[PDB]
Amino acid sequence: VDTCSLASPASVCRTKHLHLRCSVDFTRRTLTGTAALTVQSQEDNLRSLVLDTKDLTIEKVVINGQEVKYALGERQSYKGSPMEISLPIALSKNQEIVIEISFETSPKSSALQWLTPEQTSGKEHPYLFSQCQAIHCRAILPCQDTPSVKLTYTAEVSVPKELVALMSAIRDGETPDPEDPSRKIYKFIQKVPIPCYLIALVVGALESRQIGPRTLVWSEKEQVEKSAYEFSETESMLKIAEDLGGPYVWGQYDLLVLPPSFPYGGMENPCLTFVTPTLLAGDKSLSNVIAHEISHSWTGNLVTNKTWDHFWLNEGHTVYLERHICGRLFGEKFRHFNALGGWGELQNSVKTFGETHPFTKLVVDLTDIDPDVAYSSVPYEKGFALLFYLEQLLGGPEIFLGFLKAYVEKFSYKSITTDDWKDFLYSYFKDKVDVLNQVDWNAWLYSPGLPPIKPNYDMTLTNACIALSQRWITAKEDDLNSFNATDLKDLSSHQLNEFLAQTLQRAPLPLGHIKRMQEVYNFNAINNSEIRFRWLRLCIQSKWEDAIPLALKMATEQGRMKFTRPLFKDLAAFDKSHDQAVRTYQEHKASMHPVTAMLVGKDLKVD
Ligand SMILES: O=C(O)c1ccc(CN2C[C@@H]3C[C@H]2CN3Cc2ccc(Oc3ccc(-c4ncco4)cc3)cc2)cc1
Ligand SMILES: [Yb+3]
Ligand SMILES: [Yb+3]
Ligand SMILES: [Zn+2]
């Protein structure tokens, strides 16, 4: 039972394939077309079925060439409206039928962001992108919007001829639209069964550059050169991921660099990973996000969470694989550095929510909870901490990686729960069950707050970060003159970021210390988004008014939620910038991504 879906469950019927034929209308801000669902009955005498929809206009439903009866139920807030379809003939078990639904999206679809030419790099063409995870696919097309169902898909997308369409699938050609010569049709094929949250579409003035044997980078022309360099390690990361998880089954691994309002660091859309342009640091330092998206090609896209309550399965194992890829490229001391940094991010999330908050549990109950509201570092970091703890308990990384590959092999093309994972862990490590029974499973999986045990971490690379952060925190006015630009000479960008994260955990610091830090280190000149974000939070929480325009500019010139949400919250919490934060949100709201707009509104208590 998936409590986030209003559709018939997988025990009643299952969508085997989607054939999508649609047209993108930038003047109306609508996607119009037909979603033809091949559905297999799982029951005898099946006469109706229910699909998820959200702000969709339904024109008609056709089965066997004839229009059928359908009804839309009352809207259930963020879940949308259930659509019940009356089948013309009762189905026996395993019988399949094709249901062609003619629909139109709303301009306010929570899955989409429609951009004006002014909101793009080129300024001459509009742009469109989707983001279906977790339950936004129902805001694009009628479907069983649950990761417990996997389907293949084909698509034909009509767009203005000057633009390019891409999807989370293999490109299958382009032609002039026969029905309209001012338009082009782009075709797509996804032969690997996927959960519908993995369906994705982008339409814009896109260009491509090859960066590897199975990888193109796509973006507007202005970003192509910088993106090709930034993500040049992609093929090397794919090779390591294949060694760790088994064959890469998806064919292509392309990257799309979105406009700055893209709400996440990345999204693992199969064949076409979507990434934020905030990764463009100029030195490949934020490449762990690519390693993370690559890892999802096994943990999440092949082995999928059965419901959103088990999302930690997707995230925890992916962070685990991501840290092994970066460890293979940069060394074991680096894997430990990132792992320890992750524990710190977990401390921050637990502190923010509170140690008894149900969103700090590894397995959550999302029945009447919007998954976008529950989203945090918890399933990533508490999930990673559990696996890292298990690796240490069970004999080390080589042994635990054997389990990871067997786990991916066992559950490929399936959707699983925490109980399925735990059962297989016990089966694989049957000769180590005495060790496994020492784990406080109830606390790890079902209890809020920090985990009951903290793993062992090598401190080699972290030591210099802690030492410099402690020098600043313990410094008095008479010690400020001792700081100098030479303090940073032996720190990598990763270490500078960690120094800032350690210091931010003890914020606020006195205003004089923050002014001195700018005087000696010139942090205002750093473009790296992670470093700049932590530095600006530190300035605002330490009440430096000079940082107000910089923080406001960062919060609005990009829309990655990891940065935008805490920046607006810190600005609303500083009396000097409170009104500015609220007014800036109000002025930008109508041109923001719909999910980001909703969440920033909730954070600021602005309805
Ligand atoms: O750095 C970054 O900015 C960054 C950000 C994002 C990404 C990738 N994403 C794509 C997008 C966000 C994440 C997953 N997608 C959305 C989503 C998925 C599931 C969900 O439902 C939940 C279920 C359980 C729990 C839960 N809470 C505690 C335990 O379990 C929490 C949410 C809600 C939203 C990569 C990088
Ligand atoms: Yb083909
Ligand atoms: Yb002193
Ligand atoms: Zn992820």
Q: What is the CATH number of the domain that holds 241?
A: 3.30.2010.30
CB 231 within 8 A of CB 218: no
DSSP reduced 3-state for 42: coil
141, 174, 204 — which closes off a domain? 204
Which helix (H) or strand (E) element contains residue 178?
Answer: none
Radius of gyration of the chain (CA): 25
In terms of domains, do 199 and 53 share one?
A: yes
- Confirm or deny that 409 is annotated as ligand binding: no
| Closest listed ligand to the CA of 267 | 1
Backbone dihedral angles phi then psi of residue 185, each to the nearest 5 degrees: -110, 125
In terms of domains, do 53 and 20 share one?
A: yes
Residues contacting 392, CB < 8 A, separation 6+? 455, 456
For the domain that residue 514 is a member of, what is the CATH number? 1.25.40.320
Distances from the Cα of 503 to the Cα of 444, 472, 492, 520, 538, angstroms: 28, 8, 17, 16, 8
Residue 179's Cβ-count burial label (10 Å; 0-12, 13-18, 19+) is exposed
Q: Say if ligand 1 is within 6 A of residue 134 CB.
A: yes
- Which atom number of ligand 1 is nearest to the Cα of residue 562? 3
CB 273 within 8 A of CB 267: yes
Total domain count, the chain = 4
Q: Please give the residue range of the domain that contains residue 209.
A: 205-301
Considering only CA atoms, which of 189, 137, 180, 135 is closest in space to residue 161? 180
Considering only CA atoms, which of 72, 48, 52 is closest in space to residue 60? 72
Any bridge partners for residue 257, and if so which? Answer: 275
DSSP reduced 3-state for 121: coil
Share in percent of the chain as helix, strand, coil (round to 5): 45, 25, 30
Which helix (H) or strand (E) element contains residue 333?
Answer: helix 332-353
- CA neighbours closer than 13 Å in the CB half-sphere of residue 114: 15
For CA atoms 276, 278, 282, 288, give the dihedral sign: negative
Distance (Å, whole) CA 606 – CA 582: 7
CA 399 to chain centre: 29
441, 458, 475 — which closes off a domain? 458
Q: Say if ligand 1 is within 6 A of residue 571 CB.
A: no
163, 179, 204 — which closes off a domain? 204
For CA atoms 380, 323, 461, 513, give the dihedral sign: negative
Distances from the Cα of 327 to the Cα of 68, 172, 218, 323, angstroms: 56, 36, 27, 6
In terms of domains, do 429 and 505 share one?
A: no
For CA atoms 413, 419, 423, 428, give the dihedral sign: positive
Own/partner contacts of 80-83, CB < 8 Å, gap of 24 or more, are: 80/6, 80/52, 80/53, 80/54, 80/55, 80/138, 80/139, 81/6, 81/53, 81/54, 82/6, 82/7, 82/50, 82/51, 82/52, 82/53, 83/50, 83/51, 83/52, 83/53, 83/58, 83/142
For CA atoms 403, 408, 410, 415, give the dihedral sign: positive
3-state secondary structure 384-434: HHHHHHHHHHHCCHHHHHHHHHHHHHHHCCEEECHHHHHHHHHHHCHHHHH
Q: How far is the CA of 512 from the centre of ligand 1 (A)?
A: 38
Q: Say if ligand 1 is within 6 A of residue 359 CB.
A: yes
> Which residue among 146, 295, 308, 321 has the greatest number of ligand 1 atoms within 8 angstroms of its CB, and so is best to mutate?
308
| Residue 3 falls inside a structural domain | no
- CA neighbours closer than 13 Å in the CB half-sphere of residue 126: 15
In terms of domains, do 239 and 144 share one?
A: no
Give me the residue label for tokens 């005898």: 44
Residues contacting 388, CB < 8 A, separation 6+? 320, 339, 455
- What's the DSSP call for residue 307? S
Centre a 10 Å sphere on the Cβ of residue 474 and count the other Cβ atoms it contains. 8
For the domain that residue 384 is a member of, what is the CATH number? 1.10.390.10
Q: Say if ligand 1 is within 6 A of residue 265 CB.
A: yes
In terms of domains, do 192 and 232 share one?
A: no
Distance (Å, whole) CA 278 – CA 119: 16
In terms of domains, do 354 and 471 share one?
A: no
Any bridge partners for residue 39, and if so which? Answer: 15, 97
Q: Which experimental method was this entry solved with? A: X-ray
Interaxial angle between packed helices 594-604 and 561-573, expressed in degrees from 0 to 180 and rounded to the nearest 10: 20
Beta strands in 278-379 (DSSP E): 303-305
Resolution, angstroms, 1 dp: 1.9
| Residue 7 falls inside a structural domain | no
In terms of domains, do 440 and 470 share one?
A: no
Distance (Å, whole) CA 119 – CA 108: 17
In terms of domains, do 105 and 80 share one?
A: yes
In terms of domains, do 454 and 308 share one?
A: yes
Which helix (H) or strand (E) element contains residue 367?
Answer: none
CA 475 to chain centre: 39
| Closest listed ligand to the CA of 449 | 1
Considering only CA atoms, which of 305, 294, 302, 317 is closest in space to residue 242? 294
